[PDB]
Each structure stands twice: as C-alpha cells, then as structure tokens.
C-alpha cells in the first residue's frame, strides 16, 4: 500500500505541460504512481482539490552553504516550496577553507567561525550526519579555493598555487561536490586570469560536473564577459551555467535583447544555461563599485557599524559627508541591497525560454533582500498568473524540470512514478511572494504543504521537523 496519496488536485508534472487532474501516490522516498489511483490501497488520502501537486522547487542559485548547517529547518526556502538547493555559487562555498576572517564576499556565509571545514568532503560529512530539510547539491567555489591556496589573493595565481587549488577542486569533486563556481567580479577573484580559472576547472570533465559562474562584468562590459565565459565553457568542454543573468546600471538597461541573443546563439553550438532571479535589485557585498553605487543602496548588515543596518546608504554617505563610493571602505565588511535593474530587461529574461529560476538569497543577512523568501512565489504568482509572463507549467517547469535537468539531479524535478517524492502542494489562485524590502521575511502565500523524499517538511505553515533532506550527487 502507498504511505500516502494526494488525490483531487490538478498535476503539473515538471515537463512543461499543461496541468491535468491526476493523483499522485508515495511509497517511501518515492512516487509510486499518477493518475487515477482510486483502487490503490494507501494508509492516508489526502485532499488537495483545488491545487496543483508539482515537483518541489530546485533553487538553482543559493548561499545556503552555512545555513544547512546552522538552520537544519531551512524555513526561508521550504516555506516556498523548495526541496533541494544548490550551493556554493559565485566561486563562494563555505568548503573547503579554515579561516576565522575570511575575505568577503566569502563573509556572507559566516554567522562567526564558520569556515571551519579543512576538507570539502568534511562538509559534506557533516550535512549527511545532520541533514537539513531540503536536499543539497553543492559546488566548490573559486575564491574559497584562492583564500584557501594564496597568501596574496590582489594577483595571478602562480603554477603552484594553481596546481594546488586544482588539487582540492578534484577532491572535492571526487567527494560529491557537483561542480565549479566562479566570481571574478569579487575582490578575492579579480586578479584571476581565464587561463587560471580554466586550469583550476580541469578536474570537471574528468568528474562530470558542471561550471557555473557570477560572470565578470554585468554592465558596459557584459560581452566581453560572456565571451569569457563561453570561450571557458569550450576550453573545459562542460556545461556552464551563467548566474544571475542581468545587464545592470541605466547605460545598460535595455540591452537584455542583446545578451540573451548572444547567449542563444551560443546554446547552438555550445552547453549553456542561465538562472535568474525576479527581482530589479541585487545584492551581495559592499562594495566601492560606481555602478552598483549609482542608485538606491540599502545596507543589509554592517559589521563596524552594526547599527547601519537597513539604512538607506545615500543618508549614511550624506552625513558622514562623502559620496556612497567614498563611505564605503570605512562601512566595510558590510553587505547591502542595489536598485541597479530595470524591470523589461527582468522580465525579458525571466521569459527567456532557458532561464531557470535562482533566488540569490543571502540567508544570513540581517535586514535581507526579500529574493530569500519569495522568490518562487513571485514567479509563479506576479508573474505567472497575474501578468501572463507565461504560463503556470512553463513557469513550474523553470524551477523543476528545467533546472534537475541542467544541474544532472537524477530522478527530480518530475512528478513521474519512480522518481523521488519532492512534491509541493500549491494554489495556483492565491500561490504569491508576501516578502517585500520593507518586510523581506514574510513567509509565502498559497504553499500548502511541501515534501522531500517523501517526507512532509512544510505543514500547517510550519517546519514539520523532518530533516529529510540529503546530499545530491551529479
Ligand atoms: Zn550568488
């Protein structure tokens, strides 16, 4: 007999195909079937007329590396729907690097000695030993390589160092690790040339995993960056997974039509992929940059300053009688908020057919970007239902289907029988985002229940205390 089946409500099976009513039978960790399961004993039978079973949701682009750990429950993303997560994105992992200071943006992950994993496999050991609700495929990160290898991070790796980071890469890739992230927009990166980069991936085709990358310039010299990206992507012959897509600062707003051409074209010849999140400002360190800079600025958490959190930065700089770029240094380390995206270049990449959905929450902030709460909702409502930006199938297939199949999570992101019981249970009528800026933790609307190898994780508005999520291997 099944453990349990959802009966009455509408499936939308993460294949991007219109919602049929069918139930959805579990047995264990798995989906035992779909459709019409009237005669099939099961132990409950619970009614979900009026809502949609899909797969559970795949962030594809989270800085969940510490939080798995230190917040097993992982509301911000259950409470959602998500079910698995994917880490160490922009080259930051928490893993694997000893460190009591690390250099930011590799700070957004410490809650306070946080680094404490010489090994990545030590990690990933630590994640099996005491899992999180949700399931986990993690990435080794660049920068986390060079704080771990260099002494001085402001230059070229040399062949030593080069070879040693290459070194942990392949271990940790050889322990599960699912790929290589970079972030060469980031302090810790910035001196890294494309052959360094190429040379520290190596281990990704002999291993299977995939490249993902915070591309180097998102603004006027966005092009040139995609072009290193792909050309990375041919050199390593692997699949390379552009984060964040975005073209940023008003000099740029508009040109998403261009990017996403060059980025379609390059899909014809070349494995390429894209996540996004929906949202017209991004966040991540502060930084002295004068784009990021150019408007809105809030600061999400400050270290010397801790008062400063949820400020707005022009009022900081104001009284402290300088420009945003020159109060900077004297804030840092500090994280914040930047209003540098224009909403039809969003829109038209969310629209993208390839582009996958990634929050970008950054779990640990203190007054943090709303994208950490509602990320998924807000597609599947806002822009879903309410604007028509696609339809529910299309937009549920972008954070399911789409995403298992370019990050190799074997048997997810489907409801088919066979394949891992990651479910949500949603109504599509009032699925919506609730967070805002002004009150960035406020849970989802419309998430029903939420489940993770079978196991219900999210009921009645509240972490079930299943901790059934596991470690993902590519
Ligand atoms: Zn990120």
């Given at each position: 007999?099944?453990?349990?089946?959802?009966?009455?409500?509408?499936?939308?099976?993460?294949?991007?195909?219109?919602?049929?009513?069918?139930?959805?039978?579990?047995?264990?960790?798995?989906?035992?079937?779909?459709?019409?399961?009237?005669?099939?004993?099961?132990?409950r039978?619970?009614?979900?007329?009026?809502?949609v079973?899909?797969?559970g949701?795949?962030?594809?682009?989270t800085?969940?590396?510490?939080y798995?750990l230190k917040?097993?429950?992982?509301?911000?993303?259950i409470?959602?729907?998500?079910?698995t997560?994917?880490?160490?994105?922009?080259?930051?992992?928490?893993?694997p690097?000893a460190?009591?200071?690390?250099?930011?943006?590799?700070?957004?992950?410490?809650?306070?000695?946080?680094?404490?994993?010489?090994?990545?496999?030590?990690?990933?050991?630590?994640?099996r030993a005491?899992?999180?609700?949700?399931?986990?495929?993690?990435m080794?990160?660049?920068?986390?390589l060079?704080?771990?290898?260099?002494?001085?991070?402001?230059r070229?790796?040399?062949?030593?160092?080069?070879?040693?980071?290459?070194?942990?890469?392949?271990?940790?890739?050889?322990?599960?690790?699912?790929?290589?992230?970079?972030?060469?927009?980031?302090?810790?990166?910035?001196?890294?040339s494309?052959?360094?980069?190429?040379?520290?991936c190596?281990?990704?085709?002999?291993?299977?995993?995939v490249?993902?990358?915070?591309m180097?310039?998102?603004?006027?010299?966005?092009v040139?960056?995609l072009e290193?990206?792909?050309?990375?992507?041919?050199?390593?012959?692997?699949?390379?997974?552009?984060?964040?897509?975005?073209?940023?600062?008003?000099?740029n707003?508009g040109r998403?039509k261009?990017?996403?051409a060059?980025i379609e074209?390059?899909?014809?010849?070349?494995?390429?992929?894209?996540?996004?999140?929906?949202?017209?400002?991004?966040?991540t360190?502060?930084k002295?940059?004068?784009?990021?800079?150019?408007?809105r600025?809030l600061?999400?958490?400050?270290?010397?300053?801790?008062?400063?959190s949820?400020?707005?930065?022009?009022?900081?700089a104001?009284?402290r009688?300088?420009?945003?770029?020159?109060?900077?240094?004297?804030?840092?380390?500090?994280?914040?908020i930047?209003?540098?995206?224009?909403?039809?270049?969003?829109?038209?990449?969310?629209?993208?057919?390839?582009?996958?959905?990634?929050?970008?929450?950054?779990?640990?902030?203190?007054?943090?970007?709303?994208?950490?709460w509602?990320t998924?909702?807000?597609?599947?409502?806002?822009?879903?239902?309410?604007?028509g930006?696609?339809?529910?199938?299309?937009?549920?297939?972008?954070?399911?289907?789409?995403?298992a199949?370019?990050?190799?999570?074997?048997?997810?992101?489907?409801?088919?029988?066979?394949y891992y019981?990651?479910?949500?249970?949603?109504?599509?009528?009032?699925?919506?985002?609730?967070?805002?800026?002004?009150?960035?933790?406020e849970?989802?609307?419309?998430?029903?229940?939420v489940?993770?190898?079978?196991?219900?994780?999210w009921?009645?508005?509240?972490?079930?205390?299943?901790?059934?999520?596991?470690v993902?291997?590519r």
């Amino acid at each position: 007999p099944f453990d349990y089946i959802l009966s009455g409500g509408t499936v939308i099976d993460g294949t991007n195909a219109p919602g049929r009513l069918a139930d959805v039978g579990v047995r264990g960790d798995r989906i035992a079937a779909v459709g019409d399961l009237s005669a099939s004993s099961a132990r409950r039978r619970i009614d979900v007329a009026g809502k949609v079973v899909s797969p559970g949701f795949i962030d594809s682009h989270t800085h969940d590396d510490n939080y798995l750990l230190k917040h097993r429950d992982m509301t911000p993303k259950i409470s959602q729907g998500v079910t698995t997560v994917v880490t160490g994105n922009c080259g930051i992992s928490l893993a694997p690097l000893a460190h009591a200071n690390p250099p930011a943006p590799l700070d957004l992950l410490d809650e306070g000695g946080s680094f404490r994993f010489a090994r990545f496999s030590d990690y990933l050991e630590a994640l099996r030993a005491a899992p999180p609700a949700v399931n986990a495929a993690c990435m080794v990160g660049h920068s986390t390589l060079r704080a771990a290898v260099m002494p001085d991070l402001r230059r070229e790796a040399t062949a030593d160092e080069i070879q040693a980071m290459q070194a942990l890469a392949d271990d940790a890739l050889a322990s599960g690790a699912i790929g290589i992230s970079t972030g060469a927009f980031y302090p810790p990166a910035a001196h890294a040339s494309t052959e360094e980069i190429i040379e520290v991936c190596r281990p990704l085709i002999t291993h299977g995993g995939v490249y993902a990358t915070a591309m180097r310039d998102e603004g006027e010299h966005i092009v040139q960056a995609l072009e290193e990206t792909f050309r990375i992507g041919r050199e390593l012959d692997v699949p390379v997974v552009i984060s964040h897509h975005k073209v940023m600062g008003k000099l740029n707003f508009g040109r998403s039509k261009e990017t996403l051409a060059l980025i379609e074209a390059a899909m014809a010849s070349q494995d390429v992929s894209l996540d996004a999140y929906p949202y017209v400002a991004g966040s991540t360190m502060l930084k002295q940059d004068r784009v990021l800079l150019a408007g809105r600025t809030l600061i999400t958490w400050c270290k010397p300053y801790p008062e400063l959190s949820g400020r707005d930065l022009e009022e900081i700089a104001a009284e402290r009688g300088k420009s945003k770029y020159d109060v900077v240094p004297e804030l840092q380390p500090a994280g914040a908020i930047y209003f540098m995206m224009d909403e039809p270049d969003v829109q038209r990449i969310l629209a993208f057919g390839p582009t996958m959905i990634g929050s970008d929450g950054l779990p640990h902030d203190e007054r943090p970007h709303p994208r950490l709460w509602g990320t998924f909702p807000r597609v599947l409502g806002h822009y879903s239902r309410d604007l028509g930006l696609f339809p529910l199938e299309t937009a549920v297939w972008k954070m399911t289907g789409l995403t298992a199949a370019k990050f190799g999570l074997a048997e997810r992101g489907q409801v088919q029988p066979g394949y891992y019981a990651d479910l949500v249970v949603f109504d599509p009528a009032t699925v919506a985002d609730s967070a805002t800026f002004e009150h960035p933790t406020e849970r989802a609307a419309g998430i029903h229940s939420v489940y993770v190898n079978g196991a219900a994780v999210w009921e009645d508005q509240s972490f079930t205390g299943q901790h059934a999520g596991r470690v993902l291997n590519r």
